[PDB]
Structures are given as C-alpha cells and as structure tokens.
C-alpha cells in the first residue's frame, strides 16, 4: 500500500514548486484543467459505452471549502482512476527528459507545465498533503494520499460515494489559508472556468442563510 | 543499482536543509565528525582483531579540493561501509519518530546530537558521492542528487584499502569552499578537539603541493 515517487518526479515536483511559488494561484487553474481533461474522456467514451455514464449521470465540477478544517474540495464525475492508474499516473511518468531540460532551462513556466500535462503537482505549492480518492467504471472507490515524501493506495472505507470521478482534496499550508474565503475562490474559479466546456459549481451561501451550488461560468 | 530513500530520509533532508539554510559551513564540521567516528570504529574493532588495519595501516582524515572539477573531497581510514551498510545507513533511518517532532518543534546541535549531520551535505552540493570500502567487502559507489540514489561496484576496484570518501559536486553559489583560505580555516575551527590527524591538500611557496596538518 505504500509507495516511493519515481525519480525524475521528485525532481519535477521541485521543478515546479520552485518556478512557481510566485504565482501560486495557478494550482487552481491546472485542478479545473485535469477536471476538464477527465470530464472529456469519459464523454469520448460514452460514444462507443453505451452504460458510461450509469455510475453518475451528471458532467461538472463542484468546488467546496471546509474552513474549519483547513480543506479545499475540487470534485469531477470525469472518468475516474483504477488502483493501478492512481499508482501509475501520479507516481510515475513518461518526452519527460527534454521537459525537464526546459523547465531547468527556463528557471514564466505555467505555460509549460499545462502543455505537458503535470500540472496536478502545482498543488504542493498550496499544500502540505494532496489526497486524491477516485471511482473508476472497471474498479471500486480508492484513496491515494501523499505529503510529497511518499504515497499510498488504499481501498475507500467508505465504498462507492463518488459514483464516478475524482475528488482532490487540498490540506492547506498555514500561509495558504486564503484559499479557505469563498470571496477568493469564487473570484479564481470564476477566472480559470471561462473556457470550460463543463459546468462549474461552487458551494457557496445566499441570504435566512442559504448554502447551495452557484454556476460559475 | 537504483533505489528510492525511505519516506522518512526524505522529510529529515528537508528538515535539515531548511534549517541550517543560514549556516551551511556546518556540513563541514558534520564530514569531520562522522569521519572520526568511523576512525574510532576502526580503532575499537582492531583492539580485537589484529587483521583489521591490514586494509590501510593509518588512522586519518585527507581533504581535498579539486577546484577544476568543482569538487570537494573528504576522505577517512575508517572501518568503511560494505554494500549493504551504503544502502541501509544512508538510504534508510535508529528514536526517529521524536527527532524529527522535536527538528520541527537552532537545531544545529540537534543533528549533531543524532548523527544525522550526513544530509546536511546537500545545503552546499547539488550531488553527493560517498567512495566505500569496508573489511567485508570490495569497494562500492553510492550517488545521489537527493531525488534517488544508486549503488554501484567501483569499477576502478580496491583504491581505498579501507575507508570512506565523501565527494561534492558544490552548487555554483557554494564555489567559496573550494578555496585553501576557506577550507584550511573552517577545517582548523572543526578539528581542534577530533582525535586523530585532519590534513588539507595545500600548497607553500615555486609553488609545491602537499599534506598540512590542520589540528
Ligand atoms: C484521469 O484524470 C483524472 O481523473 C484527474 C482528475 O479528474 C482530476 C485531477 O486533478 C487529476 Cl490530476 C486527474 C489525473 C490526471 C492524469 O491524467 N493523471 C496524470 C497526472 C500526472 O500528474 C501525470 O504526470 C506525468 C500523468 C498523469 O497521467
Ligand atoms: C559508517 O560510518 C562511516 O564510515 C562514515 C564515514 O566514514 C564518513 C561519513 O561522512 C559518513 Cl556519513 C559515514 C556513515 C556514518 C554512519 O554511521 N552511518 C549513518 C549515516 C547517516 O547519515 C545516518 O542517517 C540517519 C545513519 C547512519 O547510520
């Protein structure tokens, strides 16, 4: 259940971290991009699978704050992750070496971290634990966890919640607790949802003191 | 060959360098002091076993500065470590799970206290070399930029006899300890109390090049 990062992602890990501490901001960006790239798979899939969408019928993005517990949800009913792609994708990678070579080179990186495609990282940027539980169609919910010096995979306790898709949750540094005031998530997601072609919600109140999902975009 | 470090090295190489950030000369009082603890392993062992310093007859500690090649080297006729002592003491971490509350809770003599000043070698050096060669066992290469490390047979074998060779490749902004002025002066300030010799590779006006004793 417990797992070591390969290499040449630590030293992208630090990569990142390092090029980008002062446009921290970004690692909300590249979140609602991964949820677009997952929401657009399982749409390919649902051309060919006809039960594609029987585990949530639903496509968006949903954004919630848990201020009393230093968290920040960012959930998709995308295409989800098996137990050995969450082990795969974010423990491993593979044109990397020339990446690197750029990144090094070049330490504005943000736009080539979302070319490649590595920008679930930035989240160490924000954070001092990433965890990532995800429902496949072939597979049962799993967790993955992580505090950048190590990971691990274990079965969801509490079973099939998601239905289909991934929940990132944010444990946020000290210093990145104004992440935590709906005035500046709204004003973020709102900015990084413009060309989304996928619904994107907030949990946020209303005035008696309503909560409920605001559309963004 | 390839490995990864245990969970716990990796959060003490942070912890480490982020504390020392603002004294790094430290590293070298760090080299030193595991240097003479290996001297003094040696020293015990071969108080009952006569064979022990067949491998190499002294008890030292030589540094060297390669300035050309950017590098720093710290070598001790120490008991040495086999293959299996580079993967496990490096790789691998002993009250652990307190140091590391009581590092996050100046922690200079903490790592000191704990003998883990080893890490506090990546506060100067982008890649760390350590040149093994223990009794047991033939000579063996450990490498490491911090994000992984590998274990290799020296191929250019037995050039040791016995000991330990701890080499840098220092960052460019770490360029300063690769003068004699600097290392001779930080080297005199961390040896005045360690047992056994610490020589530099210095030169002494032509201009010739030999071992000085600093302590
Ligand atoms: C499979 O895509 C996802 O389910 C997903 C998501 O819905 C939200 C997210 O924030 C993320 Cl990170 C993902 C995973 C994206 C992905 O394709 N995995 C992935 C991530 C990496 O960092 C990577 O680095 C080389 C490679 C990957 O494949
Ligand atoms: C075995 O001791 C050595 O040969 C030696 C040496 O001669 C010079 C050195 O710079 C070092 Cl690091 C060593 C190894 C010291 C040791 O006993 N191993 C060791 C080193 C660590 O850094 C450590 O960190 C948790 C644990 C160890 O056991």
């Not at 039960?51 to 968006?60: H, P, R, V, Y």
């Not at 990971?151 to 000290?174: C, H, M, Q, W, Y």
Request: proline share 1%.
């Amino acid at each position: 259940e417990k797992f070591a990062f390969q290499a040449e992602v630590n030293r992208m890990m630090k990569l990142i971290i390092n090029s980008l501490y002062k446009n921290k901001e970004i690692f909300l960006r590249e979140l609602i991009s991964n949820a677009s790239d997952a929401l657009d798979k399982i749409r390919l899939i649902s051309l060919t699978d006809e039960n594609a969408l029987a585990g949530n019928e639903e496509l968006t993005v949903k954004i919630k704050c848990d201020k009393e517990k230093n968290l920040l949800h960012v959930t998709d009913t995308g295409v989800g992750m098996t137990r050995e792609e969450l082990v795969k994708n974010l423990g491993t990678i593979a044109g990397t070496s020339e990446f690197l070579n750029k990144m090094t080179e070049a330490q504005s990186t943000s736009e080539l971290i979302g070319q490649f495609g590595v920008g679930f990282y930035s989240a160490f940027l924000v954070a001092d634990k990433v965890i990532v539980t995800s429902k496949h169609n072939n597979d049962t919910q799993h967790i993955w966890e992580s505090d950048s010096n190590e990971f691990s995979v274990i079965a969801d306790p509490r079973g099939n919640t998601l239905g289909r898709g991934t929940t990132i949750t944010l444990v946020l540094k000290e210093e990145a607790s104004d992440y935590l005031e709906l005035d500046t998530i709204k004003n973020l997601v709102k900015k990084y949802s413009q060309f989304i072609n996928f619904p994107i919600y907030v949990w946020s109140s209303k005035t008696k003191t309503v909560w409920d999902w605001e559309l963004m975009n």
